[PDB]
Design an enzyme around this catalytic site. Structure first.
Site, short mmCIF file in Angstrom:
data_model
loop_
_atom_site.label_atom_id
_atom_site.label_comp_id
_atom_site.label_asym_id
_atom_site.label_seq_id
_atom_site.Cartn_x
_atom_site.Cartn_y
_atom_site.Cartn_z
N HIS A 13 0.81 -1.21 0.00
CA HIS A 13 0.00 0.00 0.00
C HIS A 13 0.85 1.27 0.00
CE1 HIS A 13 0.43 0.85 4.32
NE2 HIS A 13 -0.09 -0.31 4.66
N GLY A 47 3.38 5.89 10.50
CA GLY A 47 4.70 5.49 10.08
C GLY A 47 5.15 4.13 10.58
N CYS A 102 3.66 1.14 9.75
CA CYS A 102 3.44 0.07 8.79
C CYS A 102 4.79 -0.42 8.28
CB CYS A 102 2.57 0.58 7.65
SG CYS A 102 0.83 0.78 8.07
#
Ligand SMILES: *C(=N)N1Cc2cc(F)ccc2OCCCN(C(=O)COc2ccc(Cl)cc2Cl)[C@@H](Cc2ccccc2)C(=O)N1C
Ligand SMILES: *C(=N)N1Cc2cc(F)ccc2OCCCN(C(=O)COc2ccc(Cl)cc2Cl)[C@@H](Cc2ccccc2)C(=O)N1C
Ligand SMILES: [Cl-]
Ligand SMILES: [Cl-]
Lengths: 300, 302
Positions: free
Chosen positions: A41, A143, A145
């Site tokens: 993503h 931040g 992920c």
């Protein structure tokens, strides 16, 4: 002595964390050999996120649209591909800090350490269980992920989780390092919710053994039980059923303490039927299910 | 979002852990620059520990009696000295993985990460509080003495604890990295017990703010209270008293949530008188006191 929810030492994983930026997104990547793995993503704009066509999007990206920063060094991306929901960024340098590692898919009930990171920078470490409904109850900020979950086997790091998703309920979901989600989730910002969670019964038992090992035994009793009788009770409190595989896995704790599994199951059966009475076990007022039988052996 | 008992990443400390053997004892040492720090009781036999004369015993040891192994390389010891209750072993090599660090002495109620080790090998990492009775509720096995506790301030490792002792109670005691014990404990095998513990009130309130930040708010009450009022109840429940200093350090959480500290103290007073009634906060059926205000800010802000 003592009993703690302990994570594995994270140093071998800290040496693999890098910052990955594509477009308006900055998050974490996992640098092993000449590859950086991160959530796919990252290539989406926040408008793309409802129904992204990841194959079409990735084709439209160039290597130079990806900025990979190893602390203070900039790693040249020279290739890129996708395996399920994981983006793989080939770089021109192997990570010299690459540990011996494996990629593994764990099962619900199993635990692992999470190195929470922010924009490539390690922030903290904690121990997680994969819930029966295929979520984890983690701690993450923006931040985060691309943060990973792992176990260690003496020298070798088994990576089992990468963080992708926070549901509106606040629960966390993610993939293995092959990019397959744990659970029925998808990396699109469509309405999603986790299934009914249940208690990891075999882990509760393991923890009751840890309690006995530490001298805590007010919950023992003279009764034994059958697996079917125990499971009839367990299902009534949303506890996972116990299988003979679970019984075997508890075997070492059963021998270490002289308390048969189905003798200890009667203790749990009684605790569920009758409650705790404002007594505690290893300092908890609730039954703990985030220690596997192996975690208890490792620590005890 | 989310909330977890989270330790600092341990990698900077892992690169400092070595194995130390003397006589019949193997445990851990902390290798910083060209010195290895470890518990002085490494020089004792089990019989020495009944009444050890550390200065006599250290005299009788030579540098070659100290076997220091860094993974699978042996370090040459070139001098040894005693600093309070820690040994300083001088080696011929500076540790190339020495991080930016300092030694600090913490106060009860403060938390730190523990890198639990076995004969030089890092084994696990967890977050502890220094209890008000100067014990810590740790997890250790044999060969765990010399494991250290620490915090990290961006780049700088603050070492605050070295593990020495397990009390008959199953709790743990040790020193700062200057060798001074936390609490009234001694490294002699004599009767010792942890004094009355108490609950760290400012930490409990920090965790109630964490809970509000994460959606849990049933315990927020219409009422409000004063410091002296609350401190009266607290002491009846073996809760530590709340100082105006504690109100100040909660200020970021109060400002981020819009709940005044004395407002939240009203909630805590109610929970103490009335219990939770089979409700939970952040998945706990009890009040959690091993998160400092900084811990909550760090983990629920950045
Ligand atoms: C990872 N770096 N992040 C950022 C982040 C961090 C955080 F602590 C809390 C939220 C958050 O991201 C906000 C939204 C993006 N997001 C989600 O997982 C949100 O997912 C959903 C929101 C609303 C609804 Cl109706 C459904 C879903 Cl699934 C991810 C990226 C992502 C979005 C959608 C599906 C999968 C992944 C994200 O950036 N994160 C968690
Ligand atoms: C550190 N390496 N170890 C070993 C160790 C590890 C463990 F998980 C459990 C116990 C244990 O040590 C066994 C005994 C030695 N020990 C103690 O702290 C025991 O302390 C006491 C025993 C009996 C009584 Cl009445 C009081 C006390 Cl405090 C220490 C060394 C030590 C001994 C005595 C006083 C201070 C330190 C030890 O080696 N350890 C914990
Ligand atoms: Cl609890
Ligand atoms: Cl000498």
């Amino acid at each position: 002595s003592g009993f703690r929810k302990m994570a594995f030492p994270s140093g071998k994983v800290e040496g693999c964390m890098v910052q990955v930026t594509c477009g308006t997104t900055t998050l974490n990547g996992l640098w092993l050999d000449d590859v950086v793995y991160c959530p796919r993503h990252v290539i989406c704009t926040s408008e793309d996120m409802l129904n992204p066509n990841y194959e079409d999007l990735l084709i439209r990206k160039s290597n130079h649209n990806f900025l990979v920063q190893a602390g203070n060094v900039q790693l040249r991306v020279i290739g890129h591909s996708m395996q399920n929901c994981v983006l793989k960024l080939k770089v021109d340098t192997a990570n010299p800090k690459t540990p011996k590692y494996k990629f593994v898919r764990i099962q619900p009930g199993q635990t692992f350490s999470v190195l929470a990171c922010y924009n490539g920078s390690p922030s903290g470490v904690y121990q997680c269980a994969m819930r029966p409904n295929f979520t984890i109850k983690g701690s993450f900020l923006n931040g985060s992920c691309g943060s990973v979950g792992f176990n260690i086997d003496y020298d070798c790091v088994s990576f089992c989780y990468m963080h992708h998703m926070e549901l509106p309920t606040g629960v966390h979901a993610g993939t293995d390092l092959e990019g397959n989600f744990y659970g029925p989730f998808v990396d699109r910002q469509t309405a999603q919710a986790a299934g009914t969670d249940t208690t990891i019964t075999v882990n509760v038992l393991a923890w009751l053994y840890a309690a006995v090992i530490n001298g805590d035994r007010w919950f023992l009793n003279r009764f034994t039980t059958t697996l079917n009788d125990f499971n009839l009770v367990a299902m009534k409190y949303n506890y996972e059923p116990l299988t003979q595989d679970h019984v075997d896995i508890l075997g070492p704790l059963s021998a270490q303490t002289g308390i048969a599994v189905l003798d200890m199951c009667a203790s749990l059966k009684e605790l569920l039927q009758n409650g705790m009475n404002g007594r505690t076990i290893l300092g908890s007022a609730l039954l703990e299910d985030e220690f596997t039988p192996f975690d208890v052996v490792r620590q005890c």
